């Protein structure tokens, strides 16, 4: 009993199939802020299920718990509203497969999309190292209020601009954003609008548009 793999010393180290888990293929997420993770509907109604039960029975939409279960499984329109309320601020933890870095368990806020693909802000695709060619990330949630405060304070994706090893940022524009910036500022010897004095930046954008 104190030896081997079933030895109860080395038991909480082998690996535990944690609840409130998830998975999905990944998809780029422009239009997200830098602290938002687009989470699917079909997976966010099976992660925050008990939270939905709580906020549903408490609101009285279905007091008895079994009614709440049968309501969520009925896809009734009210459950979408309640789920939006519960995930209003309830950080989720997105974890890539090999978690070498300590950034590999960063945590985001959720915003609900349709379909089924855990969207992910582009800039934070570096620390994870994902490449959007089939990479799959797991979604855990913190239950206890202390764990919620941890996921919002110690791990939120907006409090880890600087990676542990090297001081300089690891939220660094990567592939298309830099090409866009490069194009947006380059000296062309002669082109339309050459030789003039417009105003501050506002009239410059007006001129370009």
């Amino acid at each position: 009993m104190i030896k081997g793999k079933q030895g109860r010393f080395r038991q909480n180290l082998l690996g535990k199939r944690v609840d409130y888990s998830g998975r999905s293929v990944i998809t780029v997420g422009p239009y997200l802020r830098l602290h938002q993770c687009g989470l699917p509907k079909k997976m966010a109604l099976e992660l925050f299920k008990p939270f939905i039960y709580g906020k549903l029975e408490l609101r009285g939409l279905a007091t008895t718990i079994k009614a709440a279960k049968k309501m969520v499984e009925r896809e009734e329109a009210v459950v979408w509203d309640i789920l939006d309320e519960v995930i209003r601020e309830h950080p989720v933890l997105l974890n890539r497969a090999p978690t070498l870095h300590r950034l590999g368990i960063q945590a985001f806020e959720p915003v609900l999309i349709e379909g089924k693909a855990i969207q992910l802000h582009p800039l934070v695709c570096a620390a994870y190292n994902a490449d959007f060619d089939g990479d799959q990330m797991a979604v855990h949630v913190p239950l206890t209020l202390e764990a919620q405060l941890e996921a919002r304070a110690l791990m939120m994706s907006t409090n880890n601009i600087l990676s542990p090893a090297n001081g300089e940022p690891i939220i660094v524009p990567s592939q298309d954003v830099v090409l866009g910036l490069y194009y947006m500022t380059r000296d062309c010897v002669n082109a339309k609008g050459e030789g003039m004095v417009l105003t501050g930046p506002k009239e410059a954008e007006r001129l370009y548009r």
Binding site: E89, L145, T158, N159
Partner: protein
């Protein structure tokens, strides 16, 4: 709330900040005692962090109030 940098210096440690905010949030979730700042659909925990940043909530204040009501 999005970042928590403002709360770091208020409770210098960044972990005692976590536990103090959790104390206040637990007080404000089922222990009644509504937040002293208005909410914007925010969860109780974010309101706790917000008030911590406002400076009107700290571990000393929570202990003082707990002792005061424990004398009752």
């Amino acid at each position: 709330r999005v970042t928590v940098q403002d709360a770091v210096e208020k409770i210098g440690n960044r972990f005692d900040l976590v536990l103090v905010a959790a104390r206040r949030a637990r007080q404000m979730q089922v222990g009644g005692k509504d937040p002293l700042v208005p909410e914007e659909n925010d969860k109780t925990t974010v309101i706790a962090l917000r008030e911590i940043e406002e400076g009107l909530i700290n571990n000393q204040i929570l202990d003082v109030r707990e002792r005061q009501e424990q004398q009752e």
